[PDB]
Design a binder for this molecule. Structure first.
Ligand SMILES: [Mg+2]
Ligand SMILES: [Mg+2]
Ligand SMILES: [Mg+2]
Ligand SMILES: [Mg+2]
Ligand SMILES: [Mg+2]
Ligand SMILES: [Mg+2]
Ligand SMILES: [Mg+2]
Ligand SMILES: [Mg+2]
Ligand SMILES: [Mg+2]
Ligand SMILES: [Mg+2]
Ligand SMILES: [Mg+2]
Ligand SMILES: [Mg+2]
Ligand SMILES: [Mg+2]
Ligand SMILES: [Mg+2]
Ligand SMILES: [Mg+2]
Ligand SMILES: [Mg+2]
Ligand SMILES: [Mg+2]
Ligand SMILES: [Mg+2]
Ligand SMILES: [Mg+2]
Ligand SMILES: [Mg+2]
Ligand SMILES: [Mg+2]
Ligand SMILES: [Mg+2]
Ligand SMILES: [Mg+2]
Ligand SMILES: [Mg+2]
Ligand SMILES: [Mg+2]
Ligand SMILES: [Mg+2]
Ligand SMILES: [Zn+2]
Lengths: 203, 59, 105, 50, 86, 122, 118
RNA sequence: CGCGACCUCAGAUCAGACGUGGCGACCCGCUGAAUUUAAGCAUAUUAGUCAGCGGAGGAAAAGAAACUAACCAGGAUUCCCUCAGUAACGGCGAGUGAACAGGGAAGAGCCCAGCGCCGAAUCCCCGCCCCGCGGCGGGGCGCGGGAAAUGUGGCGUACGGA
């Protein structure tokens, strides 16, 4: 199969061939707008292993995100408080740029549901992501038993509640001693369990 | 590509303008090492007109 | 302020502990609900054991407890195939299976 | 103002209708606690908002 | 002139009645409602005023559709059929 | 006399409309009597006339929409009014067929390994 | 062909007409503001009596939604009388008082006796 | 020059659909203080808390090890008792502070991509016939129209598999 060969091609990003491709594609994406439908995935193998199928109801949106950190949206200086909170410049955002990308893509395309997303290019000021979206009402989707899980109401707006891969990579959840601070549902659930008095009837 | 790497192919026609080139960029070298003759043809549209579909990358 | 001889204590009551206090006034109700559900399950599976599938003998891990045995997760694949039951048939006839557990000895 | 608008005129119409007193035959029902209309309004004391 | 004689110049109004909530809080030059933010799609509502949340909420008005929804849920949203004819 | 909605079901739409018109004329005369100052008899009968209006109109509407549903009974696309008005979530819900149809792989698994009914001696 | 203007402008495409596969709503809405609900009852005050005796007019009160054309059509149908003109005003109570002046060849007093107000 | 494919990209009151807003006790994701304590105060505490923004369901989230351990070893997730005010953190000051093992409640596991083999063996829509119908589905017929080789369906997924 050619998908394996494409996989090592895309893992050899510093090669002159892939570097030329990435430069040209980045220039074209920069010339385009910030949020536009792609006709088809740029990386078919990566889309397939992220869950994309060549069926009616799967669309791909190519989207652009501005690069860098996050400065505190406070007037000119004036972070009124103790000196531990005077910083405004070198702050960093808790979610990833990929998460922000798929979040705003799913916000714009409100009737579709986000599956996943992947990296297609970047330069000094933008990053470019392709987001897979599924129409949960097209019958080729609703009649397929292995993909009608996403048509349930509980999976509405995955990317905003942080249930896709990009959002999950930032909630600090996982097995073992490295992830003690998230036992239970999440960080907030762990905190709520730990900071709660259990007053039995007999104490 | 699986036929070529099994050496079950006798010649390979590759369209010249696949819009990600990466899907075929590796194929001439693979064809050379397997010793399968390959040619590059103008037009994925007219190449996929051979089959009864809109487009085809290689035959 | 400290007084004559006594113990110096550290109460963890400096957060807002009163906005989240879990009382247990519904403990008898929860027990009754649990046992009613248990009886409903026991009589929906008519002739099958109430406690569920059989489970294997297990040693406790640490040095503090490695002299006692208890019930495990499921029967391992190696012992299951030694006994001659099939992987997909054990749990349909009532045998717990877990493919994660080794067999050292 | 003599130069009203339609919404304002309807508003004034409704409150003008509301500003009447209570009929006498209600004071004679079985379970009657009402002795006079307490939601009256005089054009010079209470100024209607707006 | 700070008080009584300056109270006499108050003769033109800054607020009028708005179309969503009917309160006299629609600023005319801002063209927005100070109570519900009418031009905005979403209702203006804050958690630092429990009284303001209580003054207009779901249980306050007429429940024209919602109480019928309750009465129908108690029977399971029957449709099409009618009780057995006499 | 006492117009009632049981002997009105079998009638025809044209005399239904004519009777409605007659009742409306009578109601208008009764309102004229009310405003000019009339008898308590007429002032009482205006309510009866209004309710006669209401039930005649109800019969007309019921028969019309019933025939309309009978017309659209078989067709695939029918007006939203004739479509079932359950809750929005229940209309968005998966239908009875596709919530039941299943994949070949695990239906094969079900037929190869059905769940058994057993018991264990004490 | 050639381009004589330096501006590209959007070409004129073809826009089809609605050919709906089913009506959105099943039935047309019944006309609720008809000739019977459009005029409610005539005033019988001293001013109305003086107007009908002198100016050969009639005085009705109607709902606020009626036009002068609608009012005169309704008067013509219900009372089979020709109408010269209509003057309307929204009364501070809320209804719409309508002064309907008839054609000279009819008599307002006779029509009033026929209707029943006098 | 014209004609014809394909690729990108427009315009439609085109045919059929879908989202918006509300509530918000419980939940998920960001943002996020200062009163206060330290007998002053700046790190620390208050506190990942109030306020702010977004998003659901009848629960949500989590979940079948890139785990715990160092034993004669256990075996998805979630909750309770204990571990434990402990290891650890901390102007080592004030203060903060888990996890494993053990006992219970419940108990359920699975699917892809990829590697391959099957003549795309796959799916959607329109028109017609019969049946069913207030969850729009079943059968048949169309040298009917599309999607799809830039990959649909069947087998198959680390416990190995063909
Ligand atoms: Mg943060
Ligand atoms: Mg990471
Ligand atoms: Mg003392
Ligand atoms: Mg005054
Ligand atoms: Mg002003
Ligand atoms: Mg809001
Ligand atoms: Mg499969
Ligand atoms: Mg249309
Ligand atoms: Mg912070
Ligand atoms: Mg202090
Ligand atoms: Mg002090
Ligand atoms: Mg101080
Ligand atoms: Mg300080
Ligand atoms: Mg803190
Ligand atoms: Mg809050
Ligand atoms: Mg919402
Ligand atoms: Mg709900
Ligand atoms: Mg869930
Ligand atoms: Mg999940
Ligand atoms: Mg695994
Ligand atoms: Mg554990
Ligand atoms: Mg102790
Ligand atoms: Mg803390
Ligand atoms: Mg434990
Ligand atoms: Mg048990
Ligand atoms: Mg495949
Ligand atoms: Zn308002």
């Amino acid at each position: 199969g050619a998908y394996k060969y494409i996989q090592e091609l895309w893992r050899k990003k510093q090669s002159d061939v892939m570097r030329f491709l990435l430069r040209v594609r980045c220039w074209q994406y920069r010339q385009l707008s910030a949020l536009h439908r792609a006709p088809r995935p740029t990386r078919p193998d990566k889309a397939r292993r992220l869950g994309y199928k060549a069926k009616q109801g799967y669309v791909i949106y190519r989207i652009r995100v501005r690069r860098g950190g996050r400065k505190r949206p406070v007037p000119k200086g004036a972070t009124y408080g103790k000196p531990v909170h005077h910083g405004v410049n070198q702050l960093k955002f808790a979610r990833s740029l990929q998460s922000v990308a798929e979040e705003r893509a799913g916000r714009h395309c409100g009737a579709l549901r986000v599956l996943n997303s992947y990296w297609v290019g970047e330069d000094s000021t933008y990053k470019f992501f392709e987001v897979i979206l599924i129409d949960p009402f097209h019958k080729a989707i609703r009649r397929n038993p292995d993909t009608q899980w996403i048509t349930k109401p509980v999976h509405k707006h995955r990317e905003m509640r942080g249930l896709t891969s990009a959002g999950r990579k930032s909630r600090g959840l996982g097995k073992g001693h490295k992830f003690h601070h998230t036992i239970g549902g999440s960080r907030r659930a762990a905190w709520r369990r730990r900071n709660t008095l259990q007053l039995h009837r007999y104490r | 590509t699986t036929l070529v790497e099994n050496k079950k192919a006798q010649l390979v026609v590759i369209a010249h303008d696949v819009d990600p080139i990466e899907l075929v960029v590796f194929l001439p070298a693979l064809c050379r090492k397997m010793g399968v003759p390959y040619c590059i043809l103008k037009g994925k549209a007219r190449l996929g007109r051979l089959v009864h579909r809109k487009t085809c990358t290689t035959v | 302020a400290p007084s004559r001889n006594g113990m110096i204590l550290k109460p963890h009551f400096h957060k807002d502990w009163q906005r989240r206090v879990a009382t247990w006034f519904n403990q008898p109700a929860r027990k009754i609900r649990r046992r009613k559900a248990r009886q409903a399950r026991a009589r929906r599976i008519a002739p099958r054991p109430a406690a569920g599938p059989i489970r294997p003998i297990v040693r406790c891990p640490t040095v503090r407890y490695h002299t006692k045995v208890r019930a495990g997760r499921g029967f391992s694949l190696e012992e299951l195939r030694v006994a001659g039951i099939h992987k997909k048939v054990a749990r349909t006839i009532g045998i717990s299976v877990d493919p994660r557990r080794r067999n050292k000895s | 103002s003599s130069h009203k608008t339609f919404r304002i005129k309807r508003f004034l119409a409704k409150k003008q209708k509301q500003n009447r007193p209570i009929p006498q035959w209600i004071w004679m029902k079985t379970g009657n606690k009402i002795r006079y209309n307490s939601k009256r309004r005089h054009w010079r004391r209470t100024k209607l908002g707006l | 002139t700070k008080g009584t004689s300056s109270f006499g110049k108050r003769r033109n109004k800054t607020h009028t009645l708005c179309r969503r909530c009917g309160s006299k809080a629609y600023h005319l030059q801002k063209s927005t409602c100070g109570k519900c933010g009418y031009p905005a799609k979403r209702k203006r509502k804050y958690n630092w005023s429990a009284k303001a949340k209580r003054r207009n909420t779901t249980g306050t008005g007429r429940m024209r559709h919602l109480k019928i929804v309750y009465r129908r849920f108690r029977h399971g949203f029957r449709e099409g059929t009618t009780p057995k004819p006499k | 006399a006492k117009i009632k909605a049981r002997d009105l079901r079998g009638k025809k739409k044209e005399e239904l409309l004519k009777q409605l018109d007659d009742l409306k004329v009578e109601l208008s005369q009764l309102r004229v009597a009310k405003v000019t100052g009339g008898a308590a008899s007429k002032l009482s009968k205006i309510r009866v006339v209004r309710k006669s209006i209401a039930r005649v109109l109800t019969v007309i509407n019921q028969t019309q929409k019933e025939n309309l549903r009978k017309f659209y009974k078989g067709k695939k696309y029918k007006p939203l009014d004739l479509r079932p008005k359950k809750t929005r979530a229940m209309r968005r819900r998966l239908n009875k067929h596709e919530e039941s149809l299943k994949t070949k792989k695990q239906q094969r698994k079900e037929r190869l390994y059905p769940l058994r009914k057993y018991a264990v001696k004490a | 062909k050639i381009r004589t203007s330096p501006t590209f402008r959007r070409p004129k495409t073809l826009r089809l007409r609605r050919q709906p596969k089913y009506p959105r709503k099943s039935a047309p809405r019944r006309n609720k503001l008809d000739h019977y609900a459009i005029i409610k009852f005539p005033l019988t005050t001293e001013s109305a009596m003086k107007k009908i005796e002198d100016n050969n007019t009639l005085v009705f009160i109607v709902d606020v939604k009626a036009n002068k054309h609608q009012i005169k059509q309704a008067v013509k149908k219900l009372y089979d009388i020709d109408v010269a003109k209509v003057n309307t005003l929204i009364r501070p109570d809320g209804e719409k008082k309508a002064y309907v002046r008839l054609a000279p060849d009819y008599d307002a007093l006779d029509v009033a006796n026929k209707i029943g107000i006098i």
